[PDB]
Amino acid sequence: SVSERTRIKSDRYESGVIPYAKMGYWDAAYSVKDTDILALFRITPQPGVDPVEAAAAVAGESSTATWTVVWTDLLTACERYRAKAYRVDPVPNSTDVYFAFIAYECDLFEEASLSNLTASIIGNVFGFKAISALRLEDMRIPHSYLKTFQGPATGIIVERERLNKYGTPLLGATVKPKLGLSGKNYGRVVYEGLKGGLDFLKDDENINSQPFMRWRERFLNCLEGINRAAAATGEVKGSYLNITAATMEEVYKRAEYAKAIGSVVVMIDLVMGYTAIQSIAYWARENDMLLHLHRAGNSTYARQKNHGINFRVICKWMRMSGVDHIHAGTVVGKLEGDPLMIKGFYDILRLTELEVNLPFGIFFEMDWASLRRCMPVASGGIHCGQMHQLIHYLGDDVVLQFGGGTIGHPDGIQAGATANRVALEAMVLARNEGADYFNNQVGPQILRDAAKTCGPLQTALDLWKDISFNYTSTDTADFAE
Amino acid sequence: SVSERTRIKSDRYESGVIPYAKMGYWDAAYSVKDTDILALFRITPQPGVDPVEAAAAVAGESSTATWTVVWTDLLTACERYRAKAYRVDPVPNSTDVYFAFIAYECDLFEEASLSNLTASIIGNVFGFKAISALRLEDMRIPHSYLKTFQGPATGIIVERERLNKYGTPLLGATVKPKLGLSGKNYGRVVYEGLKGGLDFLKDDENINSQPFMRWRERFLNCLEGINRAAAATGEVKGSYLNITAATMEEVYKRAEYAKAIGSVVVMIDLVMGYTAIQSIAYWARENDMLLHLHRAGNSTYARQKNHGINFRVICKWMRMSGVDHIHAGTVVGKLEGDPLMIKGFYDILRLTELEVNLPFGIFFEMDWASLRRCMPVASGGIHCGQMHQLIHYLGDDVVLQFGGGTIGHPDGIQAGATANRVALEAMVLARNEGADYFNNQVGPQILRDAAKTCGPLQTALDLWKDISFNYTSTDTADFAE
Amino acid sequence: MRLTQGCFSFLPDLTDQQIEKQVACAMSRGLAMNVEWTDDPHPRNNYWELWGLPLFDIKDPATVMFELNEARKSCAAGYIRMNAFDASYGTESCVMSFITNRPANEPGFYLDRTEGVGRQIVYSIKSYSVQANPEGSRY
Amino acid sequence: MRLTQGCFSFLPDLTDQQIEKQVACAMSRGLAMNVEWTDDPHPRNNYWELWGLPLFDIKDPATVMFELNEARKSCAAGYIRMNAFDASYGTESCVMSFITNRPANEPGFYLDRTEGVGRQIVYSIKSYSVQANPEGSRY
Amino acid sequence: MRLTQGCFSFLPDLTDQQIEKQVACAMSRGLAMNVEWTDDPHPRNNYWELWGLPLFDIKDPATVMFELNEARKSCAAGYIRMNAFDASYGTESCVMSFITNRPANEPGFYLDRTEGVGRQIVYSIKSYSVQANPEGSRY
Numbered sequence A, B: 001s002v003s004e005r006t007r008i009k010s011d012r013y014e015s016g017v018i019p020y021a022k023m024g025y026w027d028a029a030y031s032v033k034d035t036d037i038l039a040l041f042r043i044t045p046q047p048g049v050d051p052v053e054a055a056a057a058v059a060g061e062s063s064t065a066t067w068t069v070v071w072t073d074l075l076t077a078c079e080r081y082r083a084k085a086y087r088v089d090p091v092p093n094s095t096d097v098y099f100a101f102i103a104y105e106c107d108l109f110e111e112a113s114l115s116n117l118t119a120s121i122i123g124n125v126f127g128f129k130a131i132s133a134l135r136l137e138d139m140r141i142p143h144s145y146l147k148t149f150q151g152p153a154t155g156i157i158v159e160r161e162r163l164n165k166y167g168t169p170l171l172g173a174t175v176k177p178k179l180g181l182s183g184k185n186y187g188r189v190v191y192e193g194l195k196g197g198l199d200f201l202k203d204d205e206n207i208n209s210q211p212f213m214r215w216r217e218r219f220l221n222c223l224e225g226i227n228r229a230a231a232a233t234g235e236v237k238g239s240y241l242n243i244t245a246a247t248m249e250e251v252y253k254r255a256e257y258a259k260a261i262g263s264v265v266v267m268i269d270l271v272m273g274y275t276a277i278q279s280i281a282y283w284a285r286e287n288d289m290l291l292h293l294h295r296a297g298n299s300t301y302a303r304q305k306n307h308g309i310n311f312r313v314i315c316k317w318m319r320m321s322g323v324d325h326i327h328a329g330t331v332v333g334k335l336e337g338d339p340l341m342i343k344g345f346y347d348i349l350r351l352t353e354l355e356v357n358l359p360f361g362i363f364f365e366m367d368w369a370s371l372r373r374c375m376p377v378a379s380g381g382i383h384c385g386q387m388h389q390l391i392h393y394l395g396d397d398v399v400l401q402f403g404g405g406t407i408g409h410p411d412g413i414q415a416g417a418t419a420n421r422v423a424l425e426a427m428v429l430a431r432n433e434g435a436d437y438f439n440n441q442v443g444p445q446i447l448r449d450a451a452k453t454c455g456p457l458q459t460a461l462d463l464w465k466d467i468s469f470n471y472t473s474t475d476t477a478d479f480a481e
Numbered sequence C, D, E: 001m002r003l004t005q006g007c008f009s010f011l012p013d014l015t016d017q018q019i020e021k022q023v024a025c026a027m028s029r030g031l032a033m034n035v036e037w038t039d040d041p042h043p044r045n046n047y048w049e050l051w052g053l054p055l056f057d058i059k060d061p062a063t064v065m066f067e068l069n070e071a072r073k074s075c076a077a078g079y080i081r082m083n084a085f086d087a088s089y090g091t092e093s094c095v096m097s098f099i100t101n102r103p104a105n106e107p108g109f110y111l112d113r114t115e116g117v118g119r120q121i122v123y124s125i126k127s128y129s130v131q132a133n134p135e136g137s138r139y
């Protein structure tokens, strides 16, 4: 039989099952190339599974391997395309959880395609029986791959130039109640909030088009409110018009409508997915539109330390895709946010390069290849009494969003917006004068001082003075200082 | 002050913070409507958080509430739009985890939009500090909402009619190595596998367009291999051409190319996201194309019992969106799959209606509103020696995919395909004759009997007879019998 | 070559006893059987010729085998297949189809290739038996 | 009305001592200061008039305050703003801009509405001061 | 006619001695040899039938010649080609392919012309041997 005579008989390519660590996917001596994509996984092997074999299995099944040997490897430059796990460290203060570093050849990935990158890195390995939990913690995207991506359509710098706003954080608010308002009443809230002092308002993530309000009614009424507030104040104003929809055709229809009526900004939800997001990021650059990304659904995989994808990796993928804003946490609000993790997210979104900074969760040095800077958005259960903490943790280039913290003001929406803006400006001015504003005596006193001549701020500070959200975090650091 | 005089002073709408369970989001006496969307969450409250308050917080922040009271509720029919948590039960064999049922008004949701449904149900609630873990376990999508969705472009019944294949599971295989092959060699593997007996082959999920193989080279060479195999056998043949790409424009270009050259089928990856998936599902129906969904990335949120989205909910959303195939597990292969959970997924994809079946994880009765049936795909680390288990667990309407289990055959790809097809047909024939084929004595003997006259099957059975993937599952039932 | 339409064509030709057990299985599930004949083996030849009506109200598998053997006596050389139809909601379709008779020699097919645009090929699968002789005289 | 361009316009008009502290902060960060004037308050009037060159090599905040007070003596009634420029890679842009002078009376703006297609309105923000008088005599 | 696919088909049919020299050259460069058979000579018939697996680990040219002569004993009348594969990065492709066996009489092809739009012709190259007989009976 010719098939029997030509059976392959080498150790590596005779038919049968061999461990991934013997198939080429483990190399403790591998020399990382500056063009390699690097991944860091937190691996929890099943009982009895060798930690290096588990790391090699992730490397193999996210690059070229399957569960049994295949001769067709020999029709390729197989050694080049195999990913290599090259370092496996115990996680601090843990039994049988490991940090595994894996290197992927540049050529494995389709240029400019987040769906292709994620198809390999997260496609199947999270479901492998032999690993009981797996988390993607960080990635080193090399300069050469980054240059194939657009990066943010606008970016922080051009965004502030379009708004003519420099020196303080930007300010915004989600319209509330989340659902139920009519288009006309939506425009009223937007008008009042912008007139009262906010730079932006925004559609809630689940406001798209619904029986109680179809989207064109919302868009036209909001443009009247925006332009009314602009003429009342002398400022560029806007509201994030949500163009999230079922199909790409409908998304483009809403985007084109927003452009046609002169909106400065639109917003999209992460549930629309990577391919729609990249499509609209290119569109936003081509149509002079700010692109706000709400991270809907992110916490389904980003919440727990043992399994999923750390949000800091999402930050890199979305800055690559090219959104101009992304929600990134508050520390002190109603949503999860350990301060070391949050500060790491903000650095990833905003810096030109990253240095290893383990307490912040920055495991890789990484140049951002002059991709534009993405504006983080701090939103959810915050209020103006916390302004010293927000400035301290989150810095200058951020949008601070106060939905309930604006519309919940007893003296009306304009008053709620004014309170937020006075508190913001008073805090920044004091900071620049050298105040120790993060101090629990100084910061709150700066706000009380400003409130002496601002009734709306006095009312807001008294209303929400007792509000905090202090709970044990799930997404925490592994290294101290 | 007019603002002071007109301040709202009622218990419910005076400014300030009140518990979600006092805001209308908890109602133990709520009468569920047949048009309501129902969700079942597994909730792990933080220490000290009342379980009913936690359920009301999920209901509120996934419908109309925010963290402080807002008078703008009074501009809406607010009681209609509030979601209601209406039942909170302890999870069996647990003191701190709860099953929470929540009802959502039909009108909250944009017709035919998965991105809008998910914007509400999963948008923000998984990140709330007050809940340390949250999992969406099941949903009751009402008949009225389902009728707004297409459902599967083709569906199991018309799919088999297009293939002229009735009476056994369908058969397939992923081309291996995952990455590195050229277009010409890809067509060679496809030709050999189809000629040897397979109904389909498929691009790996991470095969899109890359330096080692650009996609048009793959598509044209595969069409030569497909048509060669069809003329050699007298059967309809195909290969899932992967049209996953960075942008919707590029996805459509690859879809249109596949149609223009006569492919029966294309495939897409879940990482492309919901909006692209719905767009291509409509396109597939309009262009007479089978649409195969690979669930890349699903296990990042579907693996762990405490947090995320159970894959059975993904099954519902993807059958609604309208893919024709979805990967749904093997039980006995290399990827996670407890048999009770997997049997539940297959029922959700294939049945015309669902009855409560708690050991299978089916928590809601649900009519599928005559949306077409979605073909489950069993793939990953399986081999023909397991055929009696695959037939038992997974039934008749499934595609059984053997990548390594075909290409890893020592006597070549055609021999690997032939062994798989002989094993499949011999098992189904014996089952229909009344054999107790799932029995560990009967099933394997049926295969050895067929192998006595089929050399490729004898070789495959001896090669992989010791292979199993036996590990503790993470995604397990809460109820027995 | 061997035409491998049908769901059992990678097994040896079925005996009458084997066929009756498949029929008995389908009828025990309440399915309707019918028998069809063709001498055009093309993979896209959807509509083989009906042998009478489907046997909707038949309860004895021996009656199905009787009609199969009458079709075998009466039809020209070629292919016969046995189908089982499920009229229930959610299916309303064939759920099993296998070959009961095939010619002793099937020449099979070749692939006709037309030069399309660019590098595209316009393909046609051609049957040797069909191109040579009319229906009823092909085998 | 109060023009609320600039980053401190929801606070009272800044004193010279307050302005000097903001200048001192920016100069301690190595930023370049400049002073600009306009009597067109339109939100899209990007290019206010330069008062000399930016003070790139100046190190004493008193020198910046000197130039601000020379601009105040020389410029027509209207607005003056103080800007801080960051030439660093990754920024190369203004990082702070606030109003140092405003007219005693600003009439503000009205919204001109043109009937567009369908229900769309074509908007133009019109300044009362600009439509009435030429540059240099608007306030 | 003479089919002039392959890289030495304008030279006389190669002797086994000449073939072995070409094989020895390719193997000295580390290439993998394989042998393939067809009786469809169409220029667009990419995938001739594999004679076993490529001989990746073979180092003696006589072993390749042994397999060639086993193919010659076993295959039907038609064509056999010898290929050399270079798996190295930058190539990952065949780098030599030549005919080792051809039929004694090849009738060749004709050009089928369909009337296209305007003056365009839609062409199909048709093999006399393939249109006449099935695979394995063509020569």
Ligand SMILES: O=C(O)[C@@](O)(COP(=O)(O)O)[C@H](O)[C@H](O)COP(=O)(O)O
Residues within 6 Å of the ligand: A174, A176, A178, A204, A205, A295, A296, A327, A328, A329, A335, A377, A378, A379, A380, A381, A382, A401, A402, A403, A404, A405, B061, B066, B067, B124, B127
């Ligand atoms: O729906 C919400 O709750 C919000 O509108 C906040 O409203 P409030 O301002 O009234 O709290 C935001 O979408 C969340 O902050 C998103 O969270 P994150 O930014 O963490 O993604």
Ligand SMILES: O=C(O)[C@@](O)(COP(=O)(O)O)[C@H](O)[C@H](O)COP(=O)(O)O
Residues within 6 Å of the ligand: A061, A066, A067, A124, A127, B174, B176, B178, B204, B205, B295, B296, B327, B328, B329, B335, B377, B378, B379, B380, B381, B382, B401, B402, B403, B404, B405
């Ligand atoms: O890349 C892979 O491993 C596979 O091609 C299987 O190859 P083998 O057939 O060689 O195992 C499939 O994509 C996985 O089965 C997907 O898993 P699931 O079906 O669970 O989503």
Ligand SMILES: [Mg+2]
Residues within 6 Å of the ligand: A174, A204, A205, A206
């Ligand atoms: Mg929101």
Ligand SMILES: [Mg+2]
Residues within 6 Å of the ligand: B174, B204, B205, B206
């Ligand atoms: Mg795969």
Ligand SMILES: [Mg+2]
Residues within 6 Å of the ligand: none
């Ligand atoms: Mg013709």
